[PDB]
Amino acid sequence: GMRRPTPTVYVGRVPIGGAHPIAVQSMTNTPTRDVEATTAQVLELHRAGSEIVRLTVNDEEAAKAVPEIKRRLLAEGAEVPLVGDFHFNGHLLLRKYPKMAEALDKFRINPGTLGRGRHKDEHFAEMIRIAMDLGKPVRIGANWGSLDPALLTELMDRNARRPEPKSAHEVVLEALVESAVRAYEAALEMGLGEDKLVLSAKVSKARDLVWVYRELARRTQAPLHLGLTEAGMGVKGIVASAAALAPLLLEGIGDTIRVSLTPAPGEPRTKEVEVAQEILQALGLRAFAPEVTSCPGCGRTTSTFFQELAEEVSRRLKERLPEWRARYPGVEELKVAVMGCVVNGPGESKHAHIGISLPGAGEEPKAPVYADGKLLTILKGEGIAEEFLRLVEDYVKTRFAP
Amino acid sequence: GMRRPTPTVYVGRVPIGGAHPIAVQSMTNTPTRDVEATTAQVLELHRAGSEIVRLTVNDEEAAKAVPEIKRRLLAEGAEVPLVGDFHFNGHLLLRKYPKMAEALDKFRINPGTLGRGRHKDEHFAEMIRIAMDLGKPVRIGANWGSLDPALLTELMDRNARRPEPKSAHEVVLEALVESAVRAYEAALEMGLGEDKLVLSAKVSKARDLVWVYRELARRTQAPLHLGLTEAGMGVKGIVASAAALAPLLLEGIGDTIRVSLTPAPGEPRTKEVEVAQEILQALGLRAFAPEVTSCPGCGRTTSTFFQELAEEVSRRLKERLPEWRARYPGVEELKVAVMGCVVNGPGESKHAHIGISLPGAGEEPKAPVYADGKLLTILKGEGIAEEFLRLVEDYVKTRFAP
Ligand SMILES: C[C+](CO)[C@H](O)COP(=O)(O)OP(=O)(O)O
Numbered sequence: 001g002m003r004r005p006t007p008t009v010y011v012g013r014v015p016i017g018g019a020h021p022i023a024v025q026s027m028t029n030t031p032t033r034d035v036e037a038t039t040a041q042v043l044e045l046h047r048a049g050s051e052i053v054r055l056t057v058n059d060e061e062a063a064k065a066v067p068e069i070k071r072r073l074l075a076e077g078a079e080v081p082l083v084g085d086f087h088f089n090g091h092l093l094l095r096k097y098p099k100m101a102e103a104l105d106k107f108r109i110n111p112g113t114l115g116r117g118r119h120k121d122e123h124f125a126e127m128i129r130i131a132m133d134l135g136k137p138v139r140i141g142a143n144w145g146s147l148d149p150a151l152l153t154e155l156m157d158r159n160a161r162r163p164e165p166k167s168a169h170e171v172v173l174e175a176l177v178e179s180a181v182r183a184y185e186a187a188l189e190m191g192l193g194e195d196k197l198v199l200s201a202k203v204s205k206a207r208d209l210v211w212v213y214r215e216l217a218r219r220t221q222a223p224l225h226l227g228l229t230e231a232g233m234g235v236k237g238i239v240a241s242a243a244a245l246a247p248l249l250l251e252g253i254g255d256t257i258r259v260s261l262t263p264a265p266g267e268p269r270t271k272e273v274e275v276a277q278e279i280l281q282a283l284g285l286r287a288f289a290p291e292v293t294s295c296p297g298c299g300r301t302t303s304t305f306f307q308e309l310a311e312e313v314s315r316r317l318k319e320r321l322p323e324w325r326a327r328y329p330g331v332e333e334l335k336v337a338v339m340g341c342v343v344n345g346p347g348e349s350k351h352a353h354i355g356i357s358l359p360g361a362g363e364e365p366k367a368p369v370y371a372d373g374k375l376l377t378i379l380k381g382e383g384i385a386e387e388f389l390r391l392v393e394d395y396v397k398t399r400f401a402p
Numbered sequence: 403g404m405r406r407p408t409p410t411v412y413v414g415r416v417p418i419g420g421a422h423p424i425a426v427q428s429m430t431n432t433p434t435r436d437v438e439a440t441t442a443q444v445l446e447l448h449r450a451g452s453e454i455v456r457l458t459v460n461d462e463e464a465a466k467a468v469p470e471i472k473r474r475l476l477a478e479g480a481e482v483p484l485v486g487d488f489h490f491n492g493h494l495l496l497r498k499y500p501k502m503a504e505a506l507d508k509f510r511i512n513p514g515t516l517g518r519g520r521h522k523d524e525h526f527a528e529m530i531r532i533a534m535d536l537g538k539p540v541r542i543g544a545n546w547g548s549l550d551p552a553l554l555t556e557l558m559d560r561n562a563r564r565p566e567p568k569s570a571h572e573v574v575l576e577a578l579v580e581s582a583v584r585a586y587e588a589a590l591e592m593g594l595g596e597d598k599l600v601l602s603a604k605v606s607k608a609r610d611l612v613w614v615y616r617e618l619a620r621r622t623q624a625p626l627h628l629g630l631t632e633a634g635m636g637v638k639g640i641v642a643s644a645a646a647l648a649p650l651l652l653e654g655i656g657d658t659i660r661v662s663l664t665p666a667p668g669e670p671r672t673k674e675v676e677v678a679q680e681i682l683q684a685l686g687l688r689a690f691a692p693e694v695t696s697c698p699g700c701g702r703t704t705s706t707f708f709q710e711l712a713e714e715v716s717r718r719l720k721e722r723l724p725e726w727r728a729r730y731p732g733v734e735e736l737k738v739a740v741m742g743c744v745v746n747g748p749g750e751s752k753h754a755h756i757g758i759s760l761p762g763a764g765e766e767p768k769a770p771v772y773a774d775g776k777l778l779t780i781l782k783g784e785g786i787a788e789e790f791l792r793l794v795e796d797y798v799k800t801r802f803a804p
């Protein structure tokens with residue numbers, strides 16, 4: 001289950017591929033024609049951790065805005081790469097607005113939103129030609145919400161000739177993979193470099209996504225852009241996204257990710273970037289920020305004190321991070337434990353860089369603190385929380401000193 | 403990647419094993435001695451979907467309370483099975499309080515919290531004897547927060563003799579597996595039935611959990627209780643839990659799950675049960691409630707109207723569910739789509755049972771609705787939301803009629 005080798009594709013300054021960290025990306029939801037709102041959100045997403053940012057380029061007004069958005073970003077020294085998302089008229093917009101084409105750092109094509117049969121091949125070829133002329137990379141991104149219907153008919157007739165035809169659902173997933181593979185092969189044949197081609201083939205159900213990506217990974221050599229499309233709102237969207245991605249990421253499949261959450265009204269667009277980072281950090285693939293390991297608490301602990309302490313520690317680590325990031329290289333790998341009682345508290349604290357085990361039911365009112373697998377001190381009284389946070393600050397300064 | 407066969411273990415009326423749905427469980431956080439608070443929370447957890455509920459049985463006052471909690475549950479016709487969580491003094495509490503022993507529906511033993519070496523074997527044997535005498539099932543639950551240190555030394559010396567010794571971390575994971583396996587074999591040898599034994603071996607990091615469970619699954623025949631221990635707070639705990647479980651569940655490993663979230667202060671203990679259900683539903687393993695598939699929205703849609711509609715649909719489905727569950731068998735499998743524009747909106751809506759595709763940028767102000775893969779109607783004007791919800795109600799009545 002080691003990382004799938006792939007050629008490197010640069011999206012701006014960010015390399016994508018088997019030799020590189022899995023890159024977090026996101027997409028804006030502001031109208032792209034609104035230069036102020038869109039530039040602000042691109043910066044917001046980038047500051048949250050979005051290494052690459054996509055924006056829809058849906059019409060001429062959007063196309064006209066892109067060079068000004070890019071100008072404004074550069075003016076503040078924000079080197080975030082921009083992906084243009086094209087559907088239906090990508091070939092017209094790229095042809096008509098060469099300054100937009102040049103301002104983007106990558107073009108997204110969807111093989112199912114090119115046009116009707118004869119025109120499809122030529123629309124696709126025009127986009128690919130422009131990308132080659134400008135040295136831009138392309139994502140060929142299929143999505144089962146926009147599956148090429150002629151290809152689906154071809155595969156439905158192939159399936160019908162089988163001694164045991166597969167289900168309609170299965171054929172749809174075959175067709176999605178085929179859509180991406182065919183387009184990938186067509187681009188290569190036209191001369192686009194392996195260093196300029198990323199593929200995706202998204203579906204909205206986890207088990208299907210796994211199947212699809214295993215097929216992509218086997219059939220192609222490209223870096224893969226992995227995501228569960230239309231994952232939805234709230235806890236459902238978070239859970240579905242994690243569930244879908246983890247099996248693939250653990251098998252070494254995927255070179256960049258996007259988490260497709262529906263924000264609740266008033267919820268920041270940066271939530272999807274947090275989720276993406278948590279997925280990669282949970283699986284030990286990247287480290288972005290200190291993490292807190294804590295027990296659920298049970299009838300052995302005093303629920304509110306323990307929950308308050310864990311919350312307070314997490315809050316403080318988040319407040320310290322900007323400073324820590326600047327002073328203490330490697331601090332993103334910090335593991336801190338906050339535990340409710342003696343059953344697992346010392347042991348889990350010993351597995352962390354530093355951890356505290358509160359006293360639970362039946363225990364003397366003292367809280368041992370462990371660091372690097374051994375007892376550091378024992379805390380008691382009021383301000384356990386502030387004392388522990390001081391010990392954590394001390395530990396960081398020593399362990400992650402430059 | 404089909405379901406691992408296992409013998410069936412009944413926990414109360416709930417069967418656990420390869421022939422049965424993966425059971426959702428949880429654990430209380432109230433002091434077990436508080437009969438009113440604990441009974442209330444057991445009912446709350448059970449009504450949220452916890453098919454089995456664990457409670458700590460840490461001391462004599464807790465032990466004395468258990469038969470009254472069980473009485474109170476039965477008095478309201480709540481047949482929820484109770485698992486007693488025992489550490490350090492399990493053998494003393496079960497011996498001293500036979501009415502507690504009989505009131506429980508399953509005993510949890512942790513091989514690392516039995517006692518010191520010589521006494522450990524006898525403590526374990528006493529618990530197992532009582533379980534056999536009463537016909538109770540047992541979980542032998544190892545946890546790396548409470549790993550038997552003598553076993554770890556034995557395995558550290560075995561490792562040191564290897565031509566290429568493994569890391570200390572790797573040896574810890576070996577020891578955790580060995581702890582569970584040895585105890586399982588010991589229980590079987592003493593005469594406890596294969597129909598009375600569930601195993602777990604929990605760690606707090608996802609990739610390690612996968613390794614551990616693949617080993618358990620191979621080395622034993624028991625049903626497995628799967629969970630990422632000490633998963634933590636908030637989005638991190640949710641994501642880590644999903645990430646850890648999905649690879650295993652998709653490979654067919656795991657017969658019951660528990661999600662080990664730390665509640666934020668004032669957050670209900672039922673959140674962990676929601677998360678558990680979302681994991682299983684995301685992976686197509688169980689269906690608990692209708693789900694909404696929605697796009698993230700982008701610069702093609704009007705952010706707030708779309709986000710409000712998706713939120714409103716999700717809210718309404720949740721309000722209708724108790725009634726629907728009673729009237730319309732199978733409704734838990736309902737899939738509804740709410741989509742932002744024409745790019746993926748119709749296609750994704752066609753994959754749902756019923757879905758709506760709002761008009762995005764450039765489009766006529768009309769919203770097609772699809773059901774069973776084909777156009778049902780087209781909505782326009784105000785009250786699109788109420789009209790769509792009426793269509794969904796109509797669709798449910800027809801499709802899931804008894
Ligand atoms: C932006 C858009 C056009 O496909 C989609 O509806 C959803 O975004 P997504 O889930 O990131 O999927 P794509 O990579 O865009 O296929």
Ligand SMILES: C[C+](CO)[C@H](O)COP(=O)(O)OP(=O)(O)O
Binds near residue numbers: 298545629
């Ligand atoms: C309740 C308790 C005693 O092990 C733990 O700290 C945590 O609960 P858990 O994460 O469900 O892990 P166990 O199944 O109890 O090993």
Ligand code: SF4
Binds near residue numbers: 297300339
């Ligand atoms: S460490 Fe103690 S308080 Fe925390 S859930 Fe475990 S047993 Fe309960």
Ligand code: SF4
Binds near residue numbers: 697698701741746747
């Ligand atoms: S369906 Fe349309 S509005 Fe929704 S994210 Fe996709 S492209 Fe954007």
